[PDB]
Design a binder for this molecule. Structure first.
Ligand SMILES: C[C@@H](CC(=O)O)c1ccccc1
Length: 139
């Protein structure tokens, strides 16, 4: 083995903690999340751990609502069971330094964008005209 090189995706790597959320209940309603799940999911302040190993990116979410972990290769579709229990087909790509995560299920689609802004990692969740913005800081 040799030491590999870095990548632009290294700006995302680390341990992150949710510090603010805007419009998440309305986003979840648009997605179709039911009342009790929205209430409990909306309280969570997850930690998100992003790591890279070769071509494989892993995003882990640790919370009191539901732990999740996805590992993927950019551009390559995978199966994902979301925190709210949707079974979706996901594809994650880079667009000009933004990680763009599209989830497809039941003829619906939602896009989650993750971007570095100053020392933060901003997560924008979009479902048909409804956006939620979630801001993470380094843990
Ligand atoms: C993408 C996450 C939000 C986040 O990582 O802060 C999400 C999971 C399930 C339902 C709505 C949103």
């Amino acid at each position: 083995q040799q030491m590999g090189r870095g990548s632009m995706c290294d700006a995302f790597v680390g341990t992150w903690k949710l510090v603010s959320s805007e419009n998440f209940d309305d986003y979840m309603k648009e997605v179709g999340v039911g009342f009790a799940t929205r209430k409990v999911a909306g309280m969570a302040k997850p930690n998100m751990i992003i790591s890279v190993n070769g071509d494989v990116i892993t995003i882990k979410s640790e919370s009191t609502f539901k732990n999740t972990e996805i590992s993927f290769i950019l551009g390559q579709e995978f199966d994902e069971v979301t925190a709210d229990d949707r079974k979706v087909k996901s594809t994650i790509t880079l667009d000009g330094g933004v990680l763009v995560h599209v989830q497809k299920w039941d003829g619906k689609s939602t896009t989650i964008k993750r971007k570095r802004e100053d020392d933060k990692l901003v997560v924008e969740c979009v479902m048909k005209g409804v956006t939620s913005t979630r801001v993470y800081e380094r843990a």
